[PDB]
Amino acid sequence: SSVDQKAISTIRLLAVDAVAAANSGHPGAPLGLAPAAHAVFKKMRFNPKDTKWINRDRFVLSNGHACALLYSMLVLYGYDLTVEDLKKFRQLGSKTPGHPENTDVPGAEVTTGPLGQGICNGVGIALAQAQFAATYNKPDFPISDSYTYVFLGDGCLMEGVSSEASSLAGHLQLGNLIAFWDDNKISIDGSTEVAFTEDVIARYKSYGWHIVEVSDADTDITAIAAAIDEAKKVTNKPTLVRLTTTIGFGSLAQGTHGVHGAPLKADDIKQLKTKWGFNPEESFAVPAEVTASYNEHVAENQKIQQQWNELFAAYKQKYPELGAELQRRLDGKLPENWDKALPVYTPADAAVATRKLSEIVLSKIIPEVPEIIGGSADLTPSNLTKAKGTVDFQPAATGLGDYSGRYIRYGVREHAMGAIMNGIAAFGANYKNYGGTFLNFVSYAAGAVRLSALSEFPITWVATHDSIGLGEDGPTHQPIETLAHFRATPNISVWRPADGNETSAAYKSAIESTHTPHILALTRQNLPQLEGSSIEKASKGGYTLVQQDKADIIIVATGSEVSLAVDALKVLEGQGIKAGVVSLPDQLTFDKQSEEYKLSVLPDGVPILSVEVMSTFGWSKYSHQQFGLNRFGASGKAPEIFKLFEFTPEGVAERAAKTVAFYKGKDVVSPLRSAF
Amino acid sequence: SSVDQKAISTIRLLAVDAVAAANSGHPGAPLGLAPAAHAVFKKMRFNPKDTKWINRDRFVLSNGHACALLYSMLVLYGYDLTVEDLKKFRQLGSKTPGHPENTDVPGAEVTTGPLGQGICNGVGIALAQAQFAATYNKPDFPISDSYTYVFLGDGCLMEGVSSEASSLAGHLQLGNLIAFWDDNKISIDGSTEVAFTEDVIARYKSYGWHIVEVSDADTDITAIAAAIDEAKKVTNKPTLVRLTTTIGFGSLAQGTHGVHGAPLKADDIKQLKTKWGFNPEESFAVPAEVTASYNEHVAENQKIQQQWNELFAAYKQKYPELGAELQRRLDGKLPENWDKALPVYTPADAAVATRKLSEIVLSKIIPEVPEIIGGSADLTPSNLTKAKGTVDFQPAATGLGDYSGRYIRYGVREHAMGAIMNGIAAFGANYKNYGGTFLNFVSYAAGAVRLSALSEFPITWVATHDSIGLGEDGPTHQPIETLAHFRATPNISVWRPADGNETSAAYKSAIESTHTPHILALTRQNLPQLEGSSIEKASKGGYTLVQQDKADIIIVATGSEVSLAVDALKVLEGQGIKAGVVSLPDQLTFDKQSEEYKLSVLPDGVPILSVEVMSTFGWSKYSHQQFGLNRFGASGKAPEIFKLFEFTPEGVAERAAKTVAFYKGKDVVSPLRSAF
The missing domain is CATH 3.40.50.920 (Rossmann fold)
Known part of the structure; x- marks a missing residue:
């Protein structure tokens, strides 16, 4: 009967009522995760009236089917989403689609639902934050100090992409990443005893994550808040918080697969309302005391952002060049005339493989465009490496790089690289990020690539060894279907440049992009410079x-x-x-x-x-x-x-x-x- | 100077000489893994003159770039592959392609190279063996008792697909699977310290695997053999054998990334030969004592197969019906007139979703065709479940099924499901296996699907919720590009049946297939029975x-x-x-x-x-x-x-x-x- 208890009930019942109105969707995880959502959002710094504040904490719902929960939080906190939008959950044209979409939903950082993706996106948001903070923070100027909070379920933990990203995040010592596992023992096929009996916690320890376990996450918001505080003290490890919950908590059908993915029965909703002090005849109730409590947190967060704006102004005086660079990036603008660094060729120049032309472009533009970062997965350093004059992105504790570095060693992890790139783009600050592999193994990352297109993120795949031109590695490595697949996907630019000038045009497009992912299909073998090509025409x-x-x-x-x-x-x-x-x-x-x-x-x-x-x-x-x-x-x-x-x-x-x-x-x- | 030492040197030098002749390929892992390959093949039961003996042990090279090692073993053991084929490594049209292909290479069980795939294929071979043994073995009749041996490297361990399959294999208690990790600390980007610092062994323990560590796998073949013996005693866990090796062992460049993926220098090859007692002026040497030793093992294995053939004859007398069924399957023939079980519809019948029509087909044909097994990943039991009268494939120790079961609970693991299906098909015995998910998330498994096509395996994807017809889950779940992608891939039948009769035709094709994978794109929503459709015409x-x-x-x-x-x-x-x-x-x-x-x-x-x-x-x-x-x-x-x-x-x-x-x-x- 505290306001916190009333808020949790409000969240639960908004989510249930939204599913009921649609007669479609997923009430179980929203019921189980409402206490954690309440606790996490109370710890988060955000402005519902400025969704792009660069020092906000980010939240990602990796278990995207649970989005009635996210939408309820956004409504209660006064984002540009209302109870009337909740009534239109899963209805054609609404701002409350059945899985959250960053293009359509204010406060949705990424597009989630396809399992495993959101946690990897969170790794990328956290990677970007670390790189950004290393680039801009100065003594007395914590320009960037934000956290990345991710909710995930058993399904995300089974998808291999999350293993890839979790291994890498542990290696990268990403201490501002705090993930929460909805440990409710239920998936669509029934008990996790049927297919998911691994020791998740032991696996996450093996990756170098810190663990906090909350044994009664159905009620113990004090322990959830304390877990966040504990995670914040561990600055060199990402943290996994095990939330032991009951799926569908409160429902007559709690703890069963049947509440995972279908609306509750009307009589079940009545007894939920009565047991929590709500009117069973009423739907979409928002108690004014809950609004007041949430408004107080918003007002405090807005004062924090106001003080950040003054810090930023003082930073521009103390660090004039960095301040102007940061301002330009927050305005979404590339450096003036940056494209004058793009290499230009004539037909008298030597034949060059487009993979080498691409390396040359990157070597020229990386020093001039600080918001370019990137890396490679499943690819020889001789096929792509950092640009001269930079260092790898690594925690300094390893001696192998620094968080100010610009080149990410993804390891043999194409799919996670793709989803991490989406998270880097989602961070904002004009990041223009890239990932190299062989074209044929971009296919390993199709789940994430499609989401780059749907999410309208300007990420770039540097996809070398594009055809039978690679030769001896043979048909297991030689693309046939790959360009057709991605060209058939809406909103993917698929550049296959013929020569030096076309390769520069491809990069001009990829770096200038704000809403369209790019795949650059590049050759192993040398190609001549063409009579008649230019950046202008190829553009x-x-x-x-x-x-x-x-x-x-x-x-x-x-x-x-x-x-x-x-x-x-x-x-x-x-x-x-x-x-x-x-x-x-x-x-x-x-x-x-x-x-x-x-x-x-x-x-x-x-x-x-x-x-x-x-x-x-x-x-x-x-x-x-x-x-x-x-x-x-x-x-x-x-x-x-x-x-x-x-x-x-x-x-x-x-x-x-x-x-x-x-x-x-x-x-x-x-x-x-x-x-x- | 024992014959075993001479054999190991022979293997190493055949592999190095093959890479040298091609001036292309990967000498490092063959040099490091030759002792283990020698030891494993000496423990394996196989017939080079009968590559399809159903009770053979299977070997899978998941680190397929190391295939000069595999080809050298096959040559030395007298498979249908010779030194003259080794001289044509990576040459157009040869039987020794740059990554191994089951269609082209005698003794290659699967097509590997794309990292992560082979270990998952091995999980599928082992799953099939357990199901097969549970179906046919009787007291005094160990018809099937074979093992599955897999070599893998750091790259496979980073790919998420292998995490999925390893989690599942541990859950399934697959004690006849024995995998060997080439723990050589080197990948293409240099040290594994740059991106792969997780505790692999702790992770594999978390999945429920048994571990054996061999600290000096460059020389200690006694310990490698003992590790196999130990693994065979652990009948309820798959085993990971950690082989600590030096990449490129013996080379001047041993222990460096440079020996991973490029030919050695000629002077390096000379000193290798001299230090191991070979003539530095000679290439492709095969000492007759090595041949004699290997021939002795082949002769013993052939006597084992001869005795298996007599066991099978005695089985047919003791168990006449099972014996005839097994014989039919080993002949590659479906039951006579099995297709008379396919449902037939008329235009007077009710509208039905093709996902439901598919369930009905499976329910009719599974009881009549014992070689059909299958499962689902990332999909509600209400969208696909086992056929009535069967049980799930589970270890009996769980109480949740039995190895004689027919329905596999893959968990939320589409990519591993795809690669495991390839392994089940590779086992043989006419297995016709299927895997269900939403069509849009078949894309998560593209790496494996493409290999089904290249490997010519008759696997089937039961791919429901094929379009915007699924409705409320929205664009993250609705296929657009998916059919174009797979139709553009060579050798994939992509059935999109309109009604009951077409759905039966699709299954007739999928089950009769011997060389072409199938994807069945099926609807959530009901469709009418068409005037003019028939199995005959739709076929x-x-x-x-x-x-x-x-x-x-x-x-x-x-x-x-x-x-x-x-x-x-x-x-x-x-x-x-x-x-x-x-x-x-x-x-x-x-x-x-x-x-x-x-x-x-x-x-x-x-x-x-x-x-x-x-x-x-x-x-x-x-x-x-x-x-x-x-x-x-x-x-x-x-x-x-x-x-x-x-x-x-x-x-x-x-x-x-x-x-x-x-x-x-x-x-x-x-x-x-x-x-x-």
Whole structure:
């Protein structure tokens, strides 16, 4: 009957009533986690009227199905979300979707639901905070000192991505990360005794985490608060707080799988209300005393932010250059004319692999753009390493780097790298972060990559060894389907640059991005600098590389196949066939250009053949006929594989000539035309 | 100077010489693991002349980059692989590809290289062996008693998929699994101190594994053999053997990252040979005493198999029905007329979700086809559970099932489920195994799914909640790109059945498969039984559902959109437009039909519109215009989402009418035609 007890009941009943109104959703974990949510939010510093305050504590609901709990907290604290929005939980168009989405929900830092992701995002938020604090904090100027609080359940703990991120977070000694395990022994298939009998706590100790156990988290908010205080004293380890809860606490069906993922019965909701002092005839009740208590915490937090703003002003006087840099980043702006550092090439320059061109770009732009950080997973240092003049991101205690470092050694952890990148982006402060691996193993991280797209985060995959061009490692390593997969995903820019100028354009796009993740598909093998390429033209996503006013055919290609198309043009000239060449380094960027620009590249009245040593899926958007590779690769020297599959100037020319013949006597309109 | 020492040197030098000849590949782990490989193969029962003996011990090289080691063992033991093949390591077309492929390499049980996969495959081989032994063994008849030996490295231990599978294997008490960790402290990025500082042994204890540590695995083959003996005594836990080795042992560059993944220097190879008593002027040496020693072990193993064959004959007399069943399975044949159990529907039957139709199929065929086993990950029992009359696969000690059980509780572990399914298939004995999850989270397992395709394993994903039709869970759960991704992967049948008869055809294909993995995309929502569907027609992958001799347009659709197309046909009739309908439940199966059959479905001379509430990628193979969904979904009641995106009879009809108008006055040929 304290206000804290009333607040916990209010949270529980808002969540239950929201699920009831939707007749869909998950009441069990909200009921079990309401005490912990109340306790954690009371310890957190945040401003519901300024969701982007850079020194806020962050909260992540990794068990995203429990989002009726999150929405209830946001409503009670006066974020831009109301009881009327709760009544529209899981309803088309509402601000309260069935899993939380950062683009739609004020106070949702990331998009969660797919299990395992949110805890990894929390690792990334905490990594970014440590890097940010190391970059900007000074004596008497704690510009950044915030914590990252994550709730997770048994499902997240079973997903391998969370093991990857938890191993890495322990290695990185991320002491401002505090995670809470909803230890309720229930999943969809019933008891965790059926498939999840490991000693979780022993595993987390093996990663180097600190542990606090709260044996009665259904009621003991004093112990939950004390666990947070204890975690804050352990500055060199992330902490896992074991919350032993009853799923669906209070329900007639508490402690059963049936309360995990379906609405409660109406009579159950009545007895919940009566046992907690609420009116069983009323739904969506918000006692004014709860509002008052929560408002007091908001007012205190707002005074903390007000004092932070004055600290920041004083910082700008004491540290003029760092202060201006920080201000620029908080305004979301890159350094003025940063792109003048991008390398430019001419056709007289030597052939270079696009993986090496990418390394060169990074080496030039990292020193000039402090908000770029990145790393690599499952990849040789010889294929990607830190830029000269920087150091790895490591706790100084290891002697292997510092938190001010800029290069992250992710280990062999592609999926966690992907989800950590999302967390770094979510931190804010204009972070433009990247992750390197082989293109074929970006697929290991598909769960996170899709969330980069849905969350609108400007992360970048540096995805080398893009094709059969890698050679001897063979078909287990050679992408076929990978670009089609990601190009088919909404909101992914998939750059496959052909040369030096196109690689600079790809990075200009990736670093300038604010809402679109990028994948840069890069070669092992050397490619020539193209006659006709430029950053300007490649920035359009697709452009006419070789214009032929009397073209019998246009060849559209990407990456390593653009030079192949140019060589095929010469073979075709000897056969009496005049070809143009289009380079299409990013289909998404091209698609966003004006219809008239696109038609100037892919006009009516001429057959168009695509060439790319990968799946032909998607290519009919831009071509009438497609020469691709729709079978797995081979283990051998790369030039021999290209010859085997007829990706040679003569093989392209043969198919171009067949395309010209196939359209003789036919009327041909641009592939860009459509009926609707 | 014992023959064992000479054998170890022979293995090391064959591997080094193979890498040298290719000027590509990985000598370090072969040098470090040769003692362990020698010791393990001496304990293994196998027949190089019968790679499919069902009671063989299995070996899996999870650290597949080390395959020069595996190939050297296979050569020395007289598998169908020779020194001449070793000389062609990593050469186009050879039997010694840069990572091992089960389709190409005799004695390679699975395709490994992508890190983490092989250990999970080993879990599946061991799971299958336990299930198989529980099904067939009788007193005095140990039909199956074999072990599964896996080598792995630090990279596999960092990949989350291995954590998932190791947690599950410990839960399942898989005592015939013996894994060996190459504890050499080196990865591509240099020391494991940079990113991999967890206490691996403590983590494996937390999963319920037994541990043996071998402190000097560079030389102590007695201790490695003893570790195997110890592991065999622990019948209720999988064992991890920690092999402390020096990467590149013997090389001038031993103990450095540089020996992990590049050929040794020629002078280094000379000093290796001299220090081990070999001729530095000679490559690919095989001392006859080594051959003799290895031949003796082969001869003993062949006598063991000979006695197993007599045991099997005696088993067929003592247990006539089980013996005939086992014989049939070892012959690779399904029960005669098993498919008569497949449910058949008529248009008078009620509407049913294809997820429920799938459950019904499984309930009918599991009792009749003993080699079907399967399970689910990250999915409610209400969405998939064991078939009535069976029990879960669990160790009997838990009280929750038995090893004779047929339904696997994978937990929230999609990626490991995928790789474990590959291992179950690899075991053999005609296992036809399946794994259920939501379609959108098959993507979490992409690494393993691609390997199912490359390995030619007949595994099946039961992938429910296939689209925006799932409704309220929202865009984090609703597939868009998923079918395009897997259809773009070579050798994946992607069935999206529209009704009861098509769902039975999908299962007929999936269960009869011997070389092609299947994904069955199934609905949450109810769909009508179609006029014109049958198992016979749907078995062709694509078929004419509604024939219209005077068609102005043909609508091609899948799954939930076939009924939509049929409803649109009626709207179009009122607009004076005559449409036909094609159902395309599996594009791969359709593609494999004769050209004349395919043209009878998609003829020349008529515009064709595709309809599928997912990406339009791929659909131009079969259509002139495509109506799909190329943006993320929404959280709301499913019918409202379909209306929002105009996937309604009127919306389809509008686009069909626009398609007819767009082709007025044009000559139209089948989308199946091409220039080359």
